[PDB]
Every structure is written in C-alpha cells, then in structure tokens.
Amino acid sequence: QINRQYQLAQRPSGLPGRDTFSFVETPLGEPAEGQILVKNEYLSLDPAMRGWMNDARSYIPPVGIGEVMRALGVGKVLVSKHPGFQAGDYVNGALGVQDYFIGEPKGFYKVDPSRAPLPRYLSALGMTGMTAYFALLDVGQPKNGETVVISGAAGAVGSVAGQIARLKGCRVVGIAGGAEKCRFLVEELGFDGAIDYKNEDLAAGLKRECPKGIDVFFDNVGGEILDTVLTRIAFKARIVLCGAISQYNNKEAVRGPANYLSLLVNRARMEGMVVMDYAQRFPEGLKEMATWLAEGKLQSREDIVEGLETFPETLLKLFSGENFGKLVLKV
C-alpha cells in the first residue's frame, strides 16, 4: 500500500509557492511497538503552518527539510501497538500532511464521532476552539459588562472567542477584513459590533464601538491592528497573544507595537499562550464547548476542501481572506 506525503522541500521566502513542498509516494510501513497506524481523514489547515515552515526558534521545532509537513488532523486507528488506543478509535493529533500516520501517539486524544461531525474536532472541538476557550477565559479573564475586542475575528479562533465572550456577558467587538465577514460576525454570531479595517478607519471604528475603552484584547493578527488597539485599552486591560497572522508571510522582520507603553499608562497586561499547555484541562473544556454547541449558544463553521493533492493551493487560501470558516482538508 502507498502513503502519499507532502514533504517540506525548501524554506519559503514570503508566500509559500509551488516549489515549497514535494509530493512523494512512500510505501506504507507497519507500526512498531508503542506506535499506532492511523488512516488520516481530515487535516487542519492553520496559519501557524507558515511559522512551522520557517527556520526560527519557536514553541515547536521547525519542520525539517525532507520531513512530512506538520498538520493537526483527525483520523481512524487501523492498528494499535499502544495500550492507550484500539483499532476503530478516532483520534486527534499531529497526523501530518499525508494519507497515513505511523508513530508514537504523543499528544493524541480520542474523539467521539457520534457527538459531533468529525471535522468539528478540528475546529470548535479542536485546537482552534480550545485556543479560544483557554486563551480568553484563563488569560483574558473577561468579566460581565467588560468590552472585549477580537482581532482576526472571522477566523476559526476569533469567531469562537467572540461567542464565548458574548456568553460571559461582555460587549463584543470584532475586527475583520471585508464587509461580508463583518456582517457575518454581527448578524450570525451575535457580535455587538464589527469593524471593517479594510474599508474603514480602525481608530474611528474603535471610538464608535468601544466608548468605555477596551478591557480585553484577543489578538490573532498583531501588526498595526494590535498597535492601534493599544491606544484604546482601559485601565487593567488584558491583552492575550495567540498569534500574528499579519506577520507570517511578511518579508524578513516582525513589526513591533510602538504603543506598547500604553501597558504602563494603563497598568495593563500583555500575555502569550499556547493551547497545548492546557492539555490536562481539555476534557472539561471540550465538555463545556460541546454543551454550548448543543444548546445553540455557540456556532461553528468549517470550510471543507477535498483532496490531499490540493494541499499547496488550498494552503494559500488561508492567506487570501478567502476561506469562510475553519479551513479543513478532507483526505
């Protein structure tokens, strides 16, 4: 049997291109002791993938040249030589951009396909949803009546974070690019407001939408948006950093917030987080998220594209403002 794989072929300059990955056919091996064999079903396409491709020290090591490209996914266990897993289990884990995963199930967890559609375990019930959940609630610590601003608000992380914030009794303001995204946030997801930074001045938008200042800023994008938001934070504000998408494909230098001293003036906190640090708390987080979904208090959208072979092109859609909801690749 054949395992098709996308390997990292060369480190990209700027946007990844058609020579960035190599499409290779490898013979399917057998799991050794302490390993599992998984048939990959759905793969998570995430902006963080851009960082994983860069040769740069990070919270996880870069993908090696010639290595199968890193990807979170959901799949079915076909063979297990590991006491934690059995054949027929569905699992979430770093399955890789390939047909089959063989290896140690490090950081893998079982998911129940009877309780939600499989791709949803890559979104609201996956790492994007748990990022929103733990980043907002544990680091942002929003309180009833506070004003919460969310960047990349139409994205998988931000769209969930804003809905959670609404449920906690917050005033919720999204920042997103384009009229359709902003409409969707307000009319479908129940955001109190949405600022279209591409068609409207952000500062003016913030003035209108956040009259009492910004108590929590959930940042997925960084850059100029972060810097502008910093001018409007309230006393004892919390800024949670989950990513910086506006920096991923940028040529050769991160852009730093010139207004960072607002943290001094407002005696505010800026803090980074990574969802894997919360692994031990996933069961309670997933359980609560599942009930919010079941009760219709929270909504999740997945954009499902078919075919492993489409990976390089489909990946670009992530940086086009194109994808509508959490991008998932059906293998």
Contacts with a copy of itself by CB under 8 A lie at 57-59, 222, 227, 241-244, 247, 253-261, 263-274, 277
* Residue 179 vs 204, nearer CB to a copy of itself: 204
- Residue whose CB is less far from a copy of itself, 23 or 52: 52
Q: Minimum Å distance from CB 16 to a copy of itself?
A: 20
User: Closer to a copy of itself at the Cβ: 187 or 260?
Assistant: 260
3-state secondary structure of 127: helix
User: What DSSP letter does each residue of 260-321 carry, written as one string?
Assistant: TTHHHHTT-EEEE--GGGGGGGHHHHHHHHHHHHHTTSS---EEEEE-GGGHHHHHHGGGTT
Q: How far apart are CA 126 and CA 282, in angstroms?
A: 9
Q: Select 95 or 136, whichever has its Cβ closest to a copy of itself.
A: 136
CB of 266 to a copy of itself, least distance (A): 7
Report the nearest approach of a copy of itself to the CB of residue 162 (Å). Answer: 20
Nearer to a copy of itself, 265 or 294 (CB): 265
Q: How far apart are CA 175 and CA 194, in angstroms?
A: 6
Is the separation of the CB atoms in 73 and 41 below 8 Å?
yes
CB of 73 to a copy of itself, least distance (A): 23
Query: For residue 103, what are the contacts with CB-CB under 8 A and spacing of at least 6?
Result: 31, 35, 36
CB of 135 to a copy of itself, least distance (A): 11
CB of 17 to a copy of itself, least distance (A): 24
d(CA 303, CA 327): 5
User: Could you give the count of Cα atoms lying within 13 Å of 292 in the half-sphere of its Cβ?
Assistant: 22
- Residue 228 CB coordination number (10 Å): 18
Which residue lies nearer to a copy of itself by CB, 189 or 240? 240
| Cα(271)–Cα(12) distance, integer angstroms | 29
